[PDB]
């Protein structure tokens, strides 16, 4: 299929109307970031020649 980009939302814009929140949600989200790798050392002489 042709992928959808998002749900379509039409914002009710007018020159004298505003939308004010009356409530809130405390949202906790996860962010995973890699920091380090495995520290690998290769003996070049032993790898090539043993």
């Amino acid at each position: 299929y042709t992928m959808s980009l998002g749900a379509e939302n039409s914002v009710a814009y007018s020159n004298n109307s505003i939308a004010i929140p009356t409530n809130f949600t405390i949202s906790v989200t996860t962010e995973i970031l890699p920091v380090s790798m495995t520290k690998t050392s290769v003996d070049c002489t032993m790898y090539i020649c043993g």
Partner: protein
């Protein structure tokens, strides 16, 4: 297509697999880069049919209905001004969908301010959004409201100068 060459190439092992895997990683990285840059909204916002923004003109940045590509005049100018086993994979997002994402971002930032980036899109008049931005840089709202026509004229002139500067500089 030389079979003797491939038979000799098999002596070198999995070099070809490493080259293909590195190129595949680059290829998926490009799609990930486009996804991170442009797909920052999951709601496709549209501007109202009446472009009454208190004198502020966004025609050079909003999509042009007359063009079949549905691009803005600035985006159309930008797209016009950029010109053996090898294959070119197409990007996952076409130029039309990237233009649609930019249109959604423009509609959100015009009709809703910065509210759509932090939650639900809350509508606000654009001369009130501009006043909020003026308060963000430490200028009182009255300065924006009293001089709203001049600021709208300066903004429109600057947007036109941007289009002229892009069209006139190689």
């Amino acid at each position: 297509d030389s079979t003797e060459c491939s038979n000799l190439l098999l002596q070198y092992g999995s070099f070809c697999t490493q080259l293909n895997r590195a190129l595949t990683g680059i290829a998926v990285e490009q799609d990930k880069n486009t996804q991170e840059v442009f797909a920052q909204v999951k709601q496709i916002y549209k501007t109202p049919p009446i472009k009454d923004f208190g004198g502020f003109n966004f025609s050079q940045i909003l999509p042009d209905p007359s063009k079949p590509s549905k691009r803005s005049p600035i985006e159309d100018l930008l797209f016009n001004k950029v010109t053996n086993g090898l294959t070119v994979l197409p990007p996952l997002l076409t130029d039309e969908m990237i233009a649609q994402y930019t249109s959604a971002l423009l509609a959100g930032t015009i009709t809703s301010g910065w509210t759509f980036g932090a939650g639900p899109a809350l509508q606000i008049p654009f001369p009130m959004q501009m006043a909020y931005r003026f308060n963000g840089i430490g200028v009182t709202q009255n300065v924006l409201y009293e001089n709203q026509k001049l600021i709208a004229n300066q903004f429109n002139s600057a947007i036109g100068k941007i289009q002229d500067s892009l069209s006139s500089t190689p």
